[PDB]
Amino acid sequence: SPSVSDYTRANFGGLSEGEAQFSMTARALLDELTDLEGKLRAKLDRWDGDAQAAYWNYQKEWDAAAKDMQNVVAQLGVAIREAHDNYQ
């Protein structure tokens, strides 16, 4: 019943809403981890040697996982723009 055009605009609306939600979730996670790293580093000098070594390995892992979310939303944003025929 609706036209091809009606369904097409509806689909681009959904893509835009989804992209914005995934972007807000990625930004929220980055803020929370940056805040935690500040708190942990305050007295890192007073930790046991083995625990200090653990920190550098575990920090590396949680930061990489967060960075991956951010890369995914960047690529999705570009793909959606080009699907709209917008190359600027």
From Swiss-Prot:
Q: Say if the entry is tagged with keyword Aminoacyl-tRNA synthetase.
A: no
Q: Which InterPro entries match?
A: ESAT-6-like_sf, T7SS_ESAT-6-like
Q: Which Pfam families match?
A: WXG100
Q: Name one GO cellular component term.
A: extracellular region
Keywords (A to Z) from UniProt: Secreted
Question: In terms of one coarse class, where is the protein primarily found?
Answer: secreted
Please state where this protein is localized.
Secreted
Q: Which domain of life is it from?
A: Bacteria
Identify its protein family. Answer: Belongs to the WXG100 family. ESAT-6 subfamily.
Q: What exactly does this protein do? A: May help regulate assembly and function of the type VII secretion system (T7SS). EsxA disassembles pre-formed EccC-EsxB multimers, possibly by making EccC-EsxA-EsxB trimers instead of EccC-EsxB-EsxB-EccC tetramers.
Quaternary structure note: Forms a tight 1:1 complex with EsxB. Forms a complex with EccC and EsxB, probably wholly mediated by EsxB.
Stated name of the protein: ESAT-6-like protein EsxA
